[PDB]
Design an enzyme around this catalytic site. Structure first.
Site, PDB file in Angstrom:
ATOM      1  N   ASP A  89      38.953  45.009  53.523  1.00 18.01           N
ATOM      2  CA  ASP A  89      39.696  45.970  52.720  1.00 18.01           C
ATOM      3  C   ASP A  89      38.752  46.633  51.718  1.00 18.01           C
ATOM      4  O   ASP A  89      39.009  46.618  50.514  1.00 18.01           O
ATOM      5  CB  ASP A  89      40.879  45.302  52.008  1.00 18.01           C
ATOM      6  CG  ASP A  89      41.860  46.268  51.362  1.00 18.01           C
ATOM      7  OD1 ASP A  89      41.703  47.492  51.554  1.00 18.01           O
ATOM      8  OD2 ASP A  89      42.775  45.787  50.664  1.00 18.01           O
TER       9      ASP A  89
ATOM     10  N   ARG B 273      39.431  52.168  45.650  1.00 21.76           N
ATOM     11  CA  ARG B 273      40.432  51.511  44.822  1.00 21.76           C
ATOM     12  C   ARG B 273      39.998  50.087  44.475  1.00 21.76           C
ATOM     13  O   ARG B 273      40.311  49.597  43.392  1.00 21.76           O
ATOM     14  CB  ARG B 273      41.793  51.511  45.531  1.00 21.76           C
ATOM     15  CG  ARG B 273      41.810  50.771  46.862  1.00 21.76           C
ATOM     16  CD  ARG B 273      43.153  50.839  47.562  1.00 21.76           C
ATOM     17  NE  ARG B 273      43.126  50.104  48.822  1.00 21.76           N
ATOM     18  CZ  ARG B 273      43.196  50.657  50.029  1.00 21.76           C
ATOM     19  NH1 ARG B 273      43.430  51.951  50.158  1.00 21.76           N
ATOM     20  NH2 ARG B 273      43.032  49.911  51.109  1.00 21.76           N
ATOM     21  N   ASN B 274      39.277  49.431  45.397  1.00 23.49           N
ATOM     22  CA  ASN B 274      38.825  48.060  45.207  1.00 23.49           C
ATOM     23  C   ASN B 274      37.364  48.035  44.755  1.00 23.49           C
ATOM     24  O   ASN B 274      36.633  47.100  45.073  1.00 23.49           O
ATOM     25  CB  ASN B 274      39.032  47.237  46.482  1.00 23.49           C
ATOM     26  CG  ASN B 274      40.488  47.112  46.882  1.00 23.49           C
ATOM     27  OD1 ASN B 274      41.382  47.481  46.124  1.00 23.49           O
ATOM     28  ND2 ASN B 274      40.736  46.580  48.067  1.00 23.49           N
TER      29      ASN B 274
ATOM     30  N   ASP C  45      37.816  42.101  45.167  1.00 29.14           N
ATOM     31  CA  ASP C  45      38.644  41.648  46.273  1.00 29.14           C
ATOM     32  C   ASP C  45      40.027  41.289  45.734  1.00 29.14           C
ATOM     33  O   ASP C  45      40.132  40.649  44.692  1.00 29.14           O
ATOM     34  CB  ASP C  45      38.003  40.448  46.978  1.00 29.14           C
ATOM     35  CG  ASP C  45      38.697  40.021  48.261  1.00 29.14           C
ATOM     36  OD1 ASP C  45      39.515  40.807  48.784  1.00 29.14           O
ATOM     37  OD2 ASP C  45      38.428  38.894  48.721  1.00 29.14           O
TER      38      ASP C  45
HETATM   39  C1  LIG Z   1      42.462  48.871  34.012  1.00 32.46           C
HETATM   40  O1  LIG Z   1      41.489  48.792  35.057  1.00 32.46           O
HETATM   41  C2  LIG Z   1      41.400  47.623  35.748  1.00 32.46           C
HETATM   42  C3  LIG Z   1      40.425  46.722  35.423  1.00 32.46           C
HETATM   43  C4  LIG Z   1      40.317  45.508  36.129  1.00 32.46           C
HETATM   44  N1  LIG Z   1      39.366  44.615  35.821  1.00 32.46           N
HETATM   45  C5  LIG Z   1      39.253  43.477  36.474  1.00 32.46           C
HETATM   46  C6  LIG Z   1      40.108  43.131  37.514  1.00 32.46           C
HETATM   47  C7  LIG Z   1      41.120  44.008  37.890  1.00 32.46           C
HETATM   48  O2  LIG Z   1      41.994  43.733  38.895  1.00 32.46           O
HETATM   49  C8  LIG Z   1      41.825  42.704  39.770  1.00 32.46           C
HETATM   50  C9  LIG Z   1      42.623  41.566  39.672  1.00 32.46           C
HETATM   51  F1  LIG Z   1      43.550  41.482  38.694  1.00 32.46           F
HETATM   52  C10 LIG Z   1      42.466  40.517  40.566  1.00 32.46           C
HETATM   53  C11 LIG Z   1      41.502  40.605  41.573  1.00 32.46           C
HETATM   54  N2  LIG Z   1      41.280  39.605  42.535  1.00 32.46           N
HETATM   55  C12 LIG Z   1      42.284  38.933  43.157  1.00 32.46           C
HETATM   56  O3  LIG Z   1      43.447  39.160  42.885  1.00 32.46           O
HETATM   57  C13 LIG Z   1      41.980  37.930  44.205  1.00 32.46           C
HETATM   58  C14 LIG Z   1      43.019  37.426  45.000  1.00 32.46           C
HETATM   59  N3  LIG Z   1      42.784  36.547  45.954  1.00 32.46           N
HETATM   60  C15 LIG Z   1      41.565  36.109  46.218  1.00 32.46           C
HETATM   61  C16 LIG Z   1      40.477  36.557  45.497  1.00 32.46           C
HETATM   62  C17 LIG Z   1      40.663  37.486  44.472  1.00 32.46           C
HETATM   63  O4  LIG Z   1      39.604  37.941  43.754  1.00 32.46           O
HETATM   64  C18 LIG Z   1      38.777  36.986  43.083  1.00 32.46           C
HETATM   65  C19 LIG Z   1      40.716  41.751  41.670  1.00 32.46           C
HETATM   66  C20 LIG Z   1      40.873  42.794  40.776  1.00 32.46           C
HETATM   67  F2  LIG Z   1      40.097  43.892  40.885  1.00 32.46           F
HETATM   68  C21 LIG Z   1      41.234  45.233  37.181  1.00 32.46           C
HETATM   69  C22 LIG Z   1      42.229  46.180  37.494  1.00 32.46           C
HETATM   70  C23 LIG Z   1      42.305  47.352  36.791  1.00 32.46           C
HETATM   71  O5  LIG Z   1      43.274  48.258  37.100  1.00 32.46           O
HETATM   72  C24 LIG Z   1      43.172  48.966  38.337  1.00 32.46           C
HETATM   73  C25 LIG Z   1      44.387  49.883  38.491  1.00 32.46           C
HETATM   74  O6  LIG Z   1      44.617  50.589  37.268  1.00 32.46           O
END
Ligand SMILES: COc1cc2nccc(Oc3c(F)cc(NC(=O)c4cnccc4OC)cc3F)c2cc1OCCO
Ligand SMILES: COc1cc2nccc(Oc3c(F)cc(NC(=O)c4cnccc4OC)cc3F)c2cc1OCCO
Lengths: 287, 284
Positions: free
Chosen positions: A155, A159-160, A173
């Site tokens: 994936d 976005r990721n 991830d």
């Molecule tokens: C504000 O900006 C952002 C800043 C952010 N900074 C850090 C993380 C963010 O989101 C994530 C999250 F919460 C969880 C995971 N990983 C997992 O869930 C997971 C699950 N299973 C197995 C392994 C996994 O990984 C270890 C990944 C992410 F990227 C952010 C999101 C934002 O927002 C984006 C949209 O606005």
């Protein structure tokens, strides 16, 4: 909420999982402060303090799929490998926080400027093409690290991909790999390779294909892939050998790389090591 | 679905749009379009005055999200133009999907109407039907409303043969993660095919095609061109050819609508002015 009997885990497993666990006392979540919401779930602001140290600004998210005690043990063993991941273009988790209230939490370092797609799409932000090519390199170097660890993302997309305060692209991830193997479903068909659509086989080669699509996003400032094609006609589109067109302000050398990524045969696609050198060249030459 | 689950300020603010189940009879036996345009039935709306109104009701079975739907209800309800199909109200219940209600448009959609071989409207009528749409889109455009899916099929005729621009609201569907509908690619603008970004200028492009439909009595656009190779075709500079009974001035307006540069395309206010002069230079 899901009441998990957290005392059911194997002591040997528990002792081998001490470095990755958090303990709810050490971690403060901000349920009021929601940073984002999407397909996977809601993400919250957090405050961890390591070694009784300074507050570490982090992002916290729950995994509601994890219900029974077995599915917890599954993820804990995976978390060991995820913690070991140490790269400047990979967003590795700080650790997992189990609790008896609901489903487990996963804590990652907070990313200031957020995801890569919304960044380039944003009107206020206006990065030059020089930067857009630079973002692609960091993903490749990031994916090269994961590729060496025999990691299959399944994936890869803008976005990721997350920007820190220094605008450093880190591959994140959301546990798509998990969801697929659990429930066997909504998959990212436009980022998926021709194999993945049919066979549902996932390798580095499928990630290379997905990386091809990621490059297309960057050059189009976060346009939706296959924007003149229905989602359910993508298989036919790719079978007939039609790929994404060249963006307006996209160098021919860079688009050539995209076409290599979108090769019908899997083995013919390039390695992530090769993509680092090529994009590094294109990064240097470009005005 | 619970009709008062989320923020309860909406229900207060969206009183006018919401209609009670008691004051709405749905004739489920009488079904419109033989179920080709979804689950659309006849209906009878009890006005608070007293007398009843003939209406058409549709069941929207694409909802769990709900907030975004009712938000549009406020915008739709507060529209009023002779050439725009007004939204009467939405009927929520404790169980079942939401029911949208509109005034019964006797002669149905414009696309099938002109195609209907029994009907024989003159070119002046067809230009008449095209002008009404422009006046309808002028109103919507002025209130910053991007239709997105502008076509003959989404235009309706009443008993006075008055063309009204109707919205089915399927343009809000266009997904990241799919599980194993159609985009109007042949009506879509060049930039919309590349970005999926819609504006008033993208509706102008679609309107150009709508005129081409009218002048060809509802022919299929680009009949010898593939769906996939439609973007390249436009990038090459190729456009729809002039119909048999399409005047040169009207065809220029069509080409004017299909300008590659979006800003260079004319506004609906500008189009109304042009077609008014063309319409008035026909006998009938
Ligand atoms: C504000 O900006 C952002 C800043 C952010 N900074 C850090 C993380 C963010 O989101 C994530 C999250 F919460 C969880 C995971 N990983 C997992 O869930 C997971 C699950 N299973 C197995 C392994 C996994 O990984 C270890 C990944 C992410 F990227 C952010 C999101 C934002 O927002 C984006 C949209 O606005
Ligand atoms: C018998 O003639 C006909 C008479 C008709 N009279 C009234 C309406 C008709 O069709 C429509 C319909 F049912 C629903 C909607 N609106 C929406 O769905 C919608 C959804 N979501 C949000 C906002 C929305 O809009 C407010 C629009 C329509 F135009 C008719 C169709 C006929 O037949 C067509 C073929 O001849």
């Amino acid at each position: 909420t899901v009441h998990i009997d957290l005392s059911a885990l194997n002591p040997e497993l528990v002792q081998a999982v001490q470095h990755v666990v958090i303990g709810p006392s050490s971690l403060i979540v901000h349920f009021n402060e929601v940073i984002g919401r999407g397909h996977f779930g809601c993400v919250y602001h957090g405050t961890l303090l390591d070694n009784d140290g300074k507050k570490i600004h982090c992002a916290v998210k729950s995994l509601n799929r994890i219900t029974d005690i077995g599915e917890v043990s599954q993820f804990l063993t995976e978390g060991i490998i995820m913690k070991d991941f140490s790269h400047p273009n990979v967003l590795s988790l700080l650790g997992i926080c189990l609790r008896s209230e609901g489903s487990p939490l996963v804590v990652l370092p907070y990313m200031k400027h957020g995801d890569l797609r919304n960044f380039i799409r944003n009107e206020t932000h206006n990065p030059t093409v020089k930067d857009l090519i630079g973002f692609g390199l960091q993903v490749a170097k990031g994916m090269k690290y994961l590729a060496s660890k025999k990691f299959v993302h399944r994936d890869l997309a803008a976005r990721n991909c997350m920007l820190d305060e220094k605008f450093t692209v880190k591959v994140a991830d959301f546990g798509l790999a998990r969801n697929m193997y659990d429930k066997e479903a909504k998959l990212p068909v436009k980022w998926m390779a021709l194999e993945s659509l049919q066979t549902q086989k996932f390798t580095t080669k499928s990630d290379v294909w997905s990386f091809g699509v990621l490059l297309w996003e960057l050059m189009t400032r976060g346009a939706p892939p296959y924007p003149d094609v229905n989602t359910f006609d993508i298989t036919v589109y790719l079978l007939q050998g039609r790929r994404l067109l060249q963006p307006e302000y996209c160098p021919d050398p860079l688009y050539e790389v995209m076409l290599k990524c979108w090769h019908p045969k899997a083995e013919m696609r390039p390695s992530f090591s090769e993509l680092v050198s090529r994009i590094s060249a294109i990064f240097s030459t470009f005005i």
